[PDB]
Design a protein around this motif. Structure first.
Motif, PDB file in Angstrom:
ATOM      1  N   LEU A 118     -15.135   0.341   1.612  1.00 59.61           N
ATOM      2  CA  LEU A 118     -14.834   0.488   0.192  1.00 59.61           C
ATOM      3  C   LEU A 118     -16.098   0.552  -0.656  1.00 59.61           C
ATOM      4  CD1 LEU A 118     -11.810  -1.974  -0.054  1.00 59.61           C
ATOM      5  CD2 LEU A 118     -11.757   0.524   0.112  1.00 59.61           C
ATOM      6  N   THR A 128      -8.393   3.365   6.665  1.00 63.14           N
ATOM      7  CA  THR A 128      -9.414   3.023   5.681  1.00 63.14           C
ATOM      8  C   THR A 128     -10.699   3.801   5.935  1.00 63.14           C
ATOM      9  OG1 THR A 128      -8.449   0.815   5.465  1.00 63.14           O
ATOM     10  CG2 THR A 128     -10.685   1.126   4.636  1.00 63.14           C
ATOM     11  N   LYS A 175      -4.303   0.809  10.673  1.00 63.98           N
ATOM     12  CA  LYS A 175      -4.617   0.831   9.248  1.00 63.98           C
ATOM     13  C   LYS A 175      -6.121   0.836   9.010  1.00 63.98           C
ATOM     14  CE  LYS A 175      -4.260  -1.906   5.025  1.00 63.98           C
ATOM     15  NZ  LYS A 175      -3.951  -0.719   4.180  1.00 63.98           N
ATOM     16  N   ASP A 212     -10.386   7.268   4.529  1.00 64.03           N
ATOM     17  CA  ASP A 212     -10.632   7.236   3.091  1.00 64.03           C
ATOM     18  C   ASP A 212     -12.124   7.277   2.791  1.00 64.03           C
ATOM     19  OD1 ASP A 212      -7.892   7.087   2.564  1.00 64.03           O
ATOM     20  OD2 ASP A 212      -7.899   4.894   2.682  1.00 64.03           O
ATOM     21  N   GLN A 253      -2.535  -1.694  -3.406  1.00 62.87           N
ATOM     22  CA  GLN A 253      -3.456  -0.619  -3.056  1.00 62.87           C
ATOM     23  C   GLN A 253      -2.756   0.718  -3.237  1.00 62.87           C
ATOM     24  OE1 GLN A 253      -5.013  -0.658   0.964  1.00 62.87           O
ATOM     25  NE2 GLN A 253      -5.619   1.501   0.838  1.00 62.87           N
ATOM     26  N   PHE A 289      -7.932  -0.217  -4.763  1.00 63.47           N
ATOM     27  CA  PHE A 289      -7.021  -1.314  -5.048  1.00 63.47           C
ATOM     28  C   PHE A 289      -6.612  -1.323  -6.517  1.00 63.47           C
ATOM     29  CE2 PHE A 289      -8.519  -3.052  -1.017  1.00 63.47           C
ATOM     30  CZ  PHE A 289      -7.367  -3.633  -0.524  1.00 63.47           C
ATOM     31  N   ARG A 344     -17.922   3.786  -0.024  1.00 62.12           N
ATOM     32  CA  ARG A 344     -17.170   4.906  -0.581  1.00 62.12           C
ATOM     33  C   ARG A 344     -17.515   5.122  -2.049  1.00 62.12           C
ATOM     34  NH1 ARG A 344     -12.652   5.805  -3.587  1.00 62.12           N
ATOM     35  NH2 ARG A 344     -11.386   7.643  -3.056  1.00 62.12           N
ATOM     36  N   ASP A 390      -3.497   4.642  -2.756  1.00 65.33           N
ATOM     37  CA  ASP A 390      -4.404   5.562  -2.054  1.00 65.33           C
ATOM     38  C   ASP A 390      -5.521   4.720  -1.437  1.00 65.33           C
ATOM     39  OD1 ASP A 390      -2.803   7.797  -2.615  1.00 65.33           O
ATOM     40  OD2 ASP A 390      -3.749   8.051  -4.581  1.00 65.33           O
ATOM     41  N   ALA A 391      -6.792   5.009  -1.717  1.00 64.46           N
ATOM     42  CA  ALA A 391      -7.900   4.311  -1.081  1.00 64.46           C
ATOM     43  C   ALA A 391      -8.384   3.099  -1.862  1.00 64.46           C
ATOM     44  CB  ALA A 391      -9.074   5.273  -0.873  1.00 64.46           C
ATOM     45  N   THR A 432       0.835  -1.192   0.000  1.00 65.40           N
ATOM     46  CA  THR A 432       0.000   0.000   0.000  1.00 65.40           C
ATOM     47  C   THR A 432       0.873   1.246   0.000  1.00 65.40           C
ATOM     48  OG1 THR A 432      -1.719  -1.176   1.246  1.00 65.40           O
ATOM     49  CG2 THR A 432      -1.867   1.229   1.156  1.00 65.40           C
TER      50      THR A 432
END
Ligand SMILES: [Cl-]
Ligand SMILES: [Cl-]
Ligand SMILES: [Cl-]
Ligand SMILES: [Mn+2]
Lengths: 285, 298
Positions: free
Chosen positions: B40, B151, B147, B154, A278, A283, B43, A280-281, A251
């Motif tokens: 994710l 996330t 971590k 983000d 990955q 993948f 987002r 940034d945010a 990452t």
């Protein structure tokens, strides 16, 4: 009130620690989210190993000397202003003083068994008086007013160091942190990457939200898996060759950098860093 | 959305709702991959929708939650668990306690399952730093890792910052901004972005209405400003609005009116902090833009 190992009294609107000596084999006492305004009748609870006073109105640490077997003490989100009353807790392995009003580090010279120290979200201004904590594995000093990294040479067992949201300007004092594996220095005033020669075991390096302008002096961090460098001033695409030695890197955060203005930002990273999955945010496909 | 992901999403929601009515302190332990999947997928939904939401009645507008997950389950009891009702939250989902993860994971799960009927705005606690807020960052690294908190940031950087309900109710977490003259300025803000220390985005999440201020005054938080009653009246007349719906501040009865009931402050977290015994409120808006207020007792 039974006589079991665990006693959990969260959000019970308790305003006084009255009548707890009845517990004969209590090991963990949980008193989170109450109206407790002072630590009182805890003497006869000698067999206590974990004490949790998370989010209360305690102003002074006191009356904890009888708990000679205490291992985990949590007095987070209280009204504490000074560190005291913990000199008898010799077998303390975890100390949580999160989100208080502590101004300095003191009265921690006897805690030779401490592996985790959480002094985040306080008013600390200098790293002091932690030379006796040779068994510290994690030191959390995020959100304070610390201006310089110092007095960390004795913590040869330290593996995780968090110094986010402070007033630092230069990386230093990590010369003896040979077993450091996670380092968080985001939201400071650091301008140059330096002083990481002895920290080859680093797997996590977070120096985001600073003023860094070039990626240097991390060629030897072959064990790097996470590298958070968002919100900086990285400009040279050739600086990413410093990270080619990290073949387990997964990452990278490089957004909100001058490098992200490139129309092919996400492709040049995964071409220069083929091991990363990955960026940034999101993948990599 | 896949059907295998639908059944895994129903499992997450079910496990999060099994503790309904239990001890205010019991936690639900989700795997690190399930929480990341919620961050994710939601987002992408936040980015696929405008940063300035344009919603339509009926929907229920809730205030701050502050990680009080058992009061969030009470809000869904009074108003109805989705999709029985449409919801709009005004930010500040995470803070103290050790239940901020269940709070945000349930809201993100409902956002993924009902993307056009469930909406979440961005509060000042949904920032990407620990400059002022530390409770949620403390909870993540402690039940999981740092971590996982990264996330979440983000996902927080893509949250919408304001909503307009039926072209008459302007909704945001903080309040008005001295740099807000046209609604296009809000749409012009690009995502993802961290909450700056100044500007339009900052005031939409930090400003407060004050009774003793005429115009724009300094905020006691040290961030953004405070605005007076006459500033609200000119904002409603200029943009042809009927009500400003915000939160951010604690009020005793859960809701409080400002500038002759032209602004309302919603707070949906009863018994916030220690001994200040406030209640929670939830403003319902029906098809004819009539606002009713339900009150939850601490
Ligand atoms: Cl995404
Ligand atoms: Cl929907
Ligand atoms: Cl307009
Ligand atoms: Mn707020």
């Amino acid at each position: 009130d039974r006589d079991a190992e665990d006693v959990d009294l969260n959000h019970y609107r308790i305003g006084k620690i009255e009548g707890f000596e009845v517990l004969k084999k209590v090991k963990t006492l949980c008193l989170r989210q109450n109206l407790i305004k002072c630590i009182e009748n805890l003497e006869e609870l000698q067999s206590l190993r974990e004490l949790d006073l998370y989010d209360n109105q305690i102003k002074k640490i006191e009356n904890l000397e009888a708990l000679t077997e205490l291992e985990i003490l949590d007095i987070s989100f209280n009204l504490l202003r000074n560190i005291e009353g913990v000199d008898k807790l010799t077998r303390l392995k975890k100390l949580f003083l999160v989100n208080n009003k502590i101004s300095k580090i003191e009265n921690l010279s006897n805690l030779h068994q401490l592996q985790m120290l959480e002094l985040g979200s306080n008013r600390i201004r200098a790293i002091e008086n932690i030379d006796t904590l040779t068994n510290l594995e994690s030191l959390f000093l995020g959100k304070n007013k610390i201006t310089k990294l110092q007095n960390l040479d004795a913590l040869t067992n330290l593996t995780v160091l968090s110094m986010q949201s402070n007033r630092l300007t230069k990386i230093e004092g990590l010369q003896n942190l040979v077993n450091l594996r996670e380092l968080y220095l985001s939201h400071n005033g650091i301008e140059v990457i330096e002083g990481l020669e002895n920290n080859n075991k680093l797997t996590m390096l977070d120096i985001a939200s600073n003023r860094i302008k070039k990626i240097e002096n991390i060629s030897h961090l072959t064990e790097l898996q996470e590298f958070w460098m968002n919100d900086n001033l990285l400009e040279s695409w050739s600086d990413l060759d410093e990270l080619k030695g990290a073949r387990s890197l997964e990452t990278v955060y490089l957004e909100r950098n001058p490098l992200q203005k490139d129309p092919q930002y996400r492709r040049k990273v995964m071409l220069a860093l083929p091991s990363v999955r990955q960026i940034d945010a999101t993948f990599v496909r | 959305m896949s059907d295998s992901e639908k059944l895994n999403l129903d499992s997450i929601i079910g496990r999060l709702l099994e503790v309904q009515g239990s001890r205010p302190g019991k936690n639900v332990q989700l795997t690190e991959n399930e929480i990341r999947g919620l961050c994710l997928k939601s987002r992408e939904i936040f980015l696929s929708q405008p940063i300035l939401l344009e919603l339509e009645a009926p929907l229920k507008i809730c205030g701050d939650i502050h990680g009080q997950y058992y009061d969030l389950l009470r809000l869904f009891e009074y108003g109805g668990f989705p999709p029985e009702s449409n919801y709009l939250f005004l930010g500040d989902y995470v803070d103290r306690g050790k239940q901020s993860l269940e709070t945000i994971c349930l809201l993100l799960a409902y956002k993924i399952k009902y993307p056009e009927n469930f909406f979440l705005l961005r509060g000042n606690h949904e920032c990407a730093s620990i400059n002022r807020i530390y409770g949620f960052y403390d909870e993540c690294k402690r039940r999981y890792n740092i971590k996982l908190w990264k996330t979440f940031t983000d996902c927080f950087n893509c949250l919408p910052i304001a909503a307009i309900v039926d072209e008459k109710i302007f909704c945001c977490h903080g309040g008005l901004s001295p740099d807000l003259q046209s609604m296009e300025q809000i749409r012009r803000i690009m995502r993802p972005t961290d909450v700056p220390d100044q500007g339009l985005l900052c005031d939409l999440l930090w400003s407060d209405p004050d009774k003793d201020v005429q115009g724009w005054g300094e905020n006691d938080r040290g961030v953004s400003f405070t605005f007076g009653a006459e500033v609200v009246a000119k904002f409603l007349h200029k943009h042809d609005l009927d009500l400003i719906c915000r939160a951010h501040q604690v009020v005793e009865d859960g809701y409080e009116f400002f500038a002759k009931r032209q602004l309302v402050t919603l707070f949906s977290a009863p018994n916030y902090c220690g001994e200040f015994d406030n209640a929670g409120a939830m403003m319902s808006v029906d098809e004819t833009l009539m606002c009713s207020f339900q009150i939850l007792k601490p």
